[PDB]
Amino acid sequence: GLPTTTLPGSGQFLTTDDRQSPSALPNYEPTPRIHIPGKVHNLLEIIQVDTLIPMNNTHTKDEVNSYLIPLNANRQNEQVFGTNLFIGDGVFKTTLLGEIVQYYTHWSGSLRFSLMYTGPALSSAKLILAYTPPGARGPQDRREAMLGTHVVWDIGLQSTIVMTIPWTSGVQFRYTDPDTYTSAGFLSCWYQTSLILPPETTGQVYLLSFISACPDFKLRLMKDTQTISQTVALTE
Amino acid sequence: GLPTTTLPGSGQFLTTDDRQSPSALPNYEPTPRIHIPGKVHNLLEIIQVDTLIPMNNTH
Amino acid sequence: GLPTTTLPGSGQFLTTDDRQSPSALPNYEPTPRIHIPGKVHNLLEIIQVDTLIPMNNTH
Amino acid sequence: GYSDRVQQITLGNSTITTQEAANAVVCYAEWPEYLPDVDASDVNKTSKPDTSVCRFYTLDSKTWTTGSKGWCWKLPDALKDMGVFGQNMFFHSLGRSGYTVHVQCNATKFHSGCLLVVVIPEHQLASHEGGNVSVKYTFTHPGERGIDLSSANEVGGPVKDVLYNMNGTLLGNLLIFPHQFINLRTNNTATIVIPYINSVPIDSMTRHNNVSLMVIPIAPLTVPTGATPSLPITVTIAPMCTEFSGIRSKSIVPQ
Amino acid sequence: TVASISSGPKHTQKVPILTANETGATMPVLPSDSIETRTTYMHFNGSETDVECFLGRAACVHVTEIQNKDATGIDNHREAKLFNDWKINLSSLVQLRKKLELFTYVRFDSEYTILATASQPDSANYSSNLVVQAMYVPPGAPNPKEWDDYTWQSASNPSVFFKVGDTSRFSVPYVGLASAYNCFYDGYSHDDAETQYGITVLNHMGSMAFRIVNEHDEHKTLVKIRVYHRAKHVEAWIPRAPRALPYTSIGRTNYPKNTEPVIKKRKGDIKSY
Amino acid sequence: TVASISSGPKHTQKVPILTANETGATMPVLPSDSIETRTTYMHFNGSETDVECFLGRAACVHVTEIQNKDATGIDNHREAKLFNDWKINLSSLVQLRKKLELFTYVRFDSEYTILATASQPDSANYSSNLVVQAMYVPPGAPNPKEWDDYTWQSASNPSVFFKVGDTSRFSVPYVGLASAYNCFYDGYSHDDAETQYGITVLNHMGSMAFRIVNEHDEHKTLVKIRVYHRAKHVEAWIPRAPRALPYTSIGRTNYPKNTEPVIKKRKGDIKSY
Amino acid sequence: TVASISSGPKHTQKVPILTANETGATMPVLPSDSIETRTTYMHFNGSETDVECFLGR
Amino acid sequence: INYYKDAASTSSAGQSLSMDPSKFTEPVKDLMLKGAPALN
Amino acid sequence: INYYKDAASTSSAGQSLSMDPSKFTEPVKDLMLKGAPALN
Amino acid sequence: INYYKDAASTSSAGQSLSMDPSKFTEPVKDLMLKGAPALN
């Protein structure tokens, strides 16, 4: 008989442990694995695939239309859309990125925001996208917007433009749930010159917008998502 | 005295375990084995012998 | 199963111990350290800096 | 002078040419291949009709109009009646296949509109009734007709609400599945190569569909002034590396 | 590892930021393709986002309850909670479901942890000490009919004996007929016109039967069982869109009617911040 | 090591005892610079004044309380202590604060130890045996609303189950967004005219939710939770003046008005002994 | 280990499927003696049918 | 590691991995070859 | 040290440290180079 | 012997045995020698 002493914590059950436990049904024998395409190893692998952002959130019931950012022909100087960058809330929240970020407490890294244009091929347009780093207000006019991170996008044969929100930060991690100290800025978009439709054409054209994370990205300290809850256990 | 911590499951009895237990009657001494024809090792050995099927179940 | 005996003191909590405990949130990943001037290692380092004495205590 | 843009796919006795492609997607970066022995379980030698089943079948055409919500086809169902592919299907106990899907929609440089073409492995549909109402067989086996998401709820059928992918997930995130867009201004076809994806090496072709192909208008169709307000969309699909096993009497399936 | 390299002004014919999303790719664009950057290192590995880590902590998967009371004159033990089942799930308690359903196919060893606590809601002199028995009476296995049937001999059938207030742990390999468990299944068990739909067809693995071994004392004792499940040795294939609407049933994808808009409406314009 | 060397009479032009304190230095003067000394050795290392040792013993950081009782008809569990929070601190119980606030910046691993004891202030037949559950429902994490919400599934959220009367231990790395925790912060969360001041802005790390897993017995049971915290792997930067006045608030430096003189007045003259 | 070997058409004078059960033997006939098979491996050892396992709980 | 002195006290035995059905499936005195005629 | 005989009984697995998003982010048939035109 | 995988779970650290008061006691820009005049 070897002398032992038990410490504080004996008998506790910590749902975040990784120890051994006996095998209820020994000498069993699993079924062999066959090959299946698509294996995922890290959630970091999947948040780099871009998905659509319901940017046009202004509706009243969920609709395919809140994915469409409208553009008006012949407007000059004006603003196309605006949003803050609380990736865990608001427009971002239902996107795959938003949806995964919510399983973690802290995030750090660059984001990739792209816009794909869908107007007739014989039209043309020049837009400016601007990222405003924390510390200033959402820009109120392009002059204000153009003094921060921006890209003049020229609509052409190449249909999409990929803007990166480079990680601009004092503190090396931000909270995924919106927090002030930790806030990330604003994203706005304005006409640089203006949309022009060809003859025989009319109305609004739309941009689709996507979001995905750069390879830069870090997420840490897992927790429970506000995105799902329940009141009684389900049954069959 | 070596410091320990006990985990969840301590004291449980799982009828599907394979651990050691003291010998109630030590220094005993079993009876020798003699040879007996017919030893079975796996149930897989015996399910290969065929047996009759009551196919005509209608009684 | 290895035979053990527990000693007096089992289960006590001594606030002056230094043993191991599981990590509530594994595979975490701390934030890197950056350099900050001023690191203190011993209280003996700081009690050698002189400070003023309110000697005139009479107020 | 090769462009990403022009392409030719020849499979069996049938060929497709596109002069306005946008590359092609190969699901999960894997190309269809036959079933290796190391992965095999059924001891039966399989049948590989090759060129008589691995050719291009063009399903009947759809009509995109400003009110369209989107269409959904299931595989191998959509092909249950195409030539010898279909016969093999009803006649063997088990079968396995990959596909090349080519979705076609051309317009002019004055039109606008953008379709999402996506392949969803194991697309289990939801009942519009809620609770634990099931979706009857016939409803998930529309055949070449596919399911029309702008048709009405029916009884025992699935829900046809587009912002929810017919299953409780948002349209916006379908982009995590192999997919390609058809943006009239860029593109005129979409091509996806689908490797066989299952948790078993070979399965039944009638009780289980292993992918739904979905074509969904996202930026509404907008035709030039006084143009007819609609465009046809055509889907052509070719089984590839098909294998059938466990031949017998010929399945009889509901309806 | 560098998180960003140093990059300076650019005036090229080589534009990495113009792409064609119609192709289905997400081109790997970085901050340094469109602004001037400085070197920085990652200092991080992505350890805690590994799927083994993501699915590897215990989650509550089931809460049931049984009572110890005089069975004298009870015509239906099962009905008096003199014992009680649990049709093995992992999709009843939605918190771990969304997690799991982020994947199509998934394979993982298992580690079950059962906590049992007792309640004595009405006048008792004391708290008795009850031993729970937990058993696996699967497909072919004689189901318990009374709380003390021959079934409970369970001599071929695994079964646990632990004390109420304590905890019963153990683990289990992948006992799923196929190479992975289907998180989704767009099929039927056969080509029947009315057979059920979903995965409720596959997820076949009998139920768990709990009972108190103790005979009855003078008062009644409520014992409530909580089963926790931790995946170990995880393997997951084919990512899918996360669950947006609420769940209604074990094993079907169905969402409730007149549900509410899941995308938050702006308080303001598209232009609003 | 010598504590003092031998030194004899001196009649020099080299005076180590005259200095200019205006410079900000504390010149390292020793007994042997001004009297005649003999050799002596230190016999000591300064082991127990290491900051790891100074901050490394468990200190009580929080006492809360929850009760097990029939929740039937309770409209606000939180309010009935049917469960209860603790906005993670370490500056509520002043004994460890002064210690900690001797430093500006400070980094240390953690080891939490939770003791739970029960009280039955009014007539009970017995003492029941309750299991406590302790959880981390941080920033983004659904906060428990009732004592038996879906939240308590905590399948992604760490949570402890131990028995009242026992103790729950575990440890935690440095989960502080920056390189160190700020013991002080002369800033705001943004340039707002009315936003709060202190470190109450930074110290963001959600709260701890405790609850009893047991349903109710016939009597009521008070369970009082004490959280102890021990720093391990300590790193501290920039020493500061010790706290002289009493504390009034978590996270602000504020002292109470009409406080009392903190320097003891002489009973006598400056000249007094 | 192979569970089944590959075997093709047969037109022989050597018939493994005709036997005389009166002898008391169970002749070891396999799928490949009477249909055309493909190779497949066992992937299994028969561990949990060992008598030690069968009587050991 | 055995902690105990007696052999009965050790854990379960380990798989025969013996397996030879012929004592049960082919106890015939003159050897039968599959493919050759049963009765000559 | 494993104390148990079966593999299911061992603790959690250890980090894939595999990580290759290209099956998801770039499943295109003809390789796309960043910087070269998307559609030629 | 660490029984646990993560570093936070190990016991207390071990004595700096670093000790250098000069950053606090003599942060002067031009070095002062004891015995030499303070102000020259």
Ligand SMILES: COc1ccc(OCCCCCCn2ccnc2)c(Cl)c1
């Ligand atoms: C109490 O002893 C037992 C002895 C053996 C057992 O095995 C249980 C196997 C069930 C695995 C379920 C995993 N799953 C189910 C559906 N999806 C995932 C169980 Cl659960 C308990």
Ligand SMILES: COc1ccc(OCCCCCCn2ccnc2)c(Cl)c1
């Ligand atoms: C019960 O399980 C838990 C699982 C994880 C946890 O992590 C707690 C991290 C908080 C560290 C606080 C240190 N601190 C706070 C302010 N100054 C110093 C906690 Cl506290 C408990």
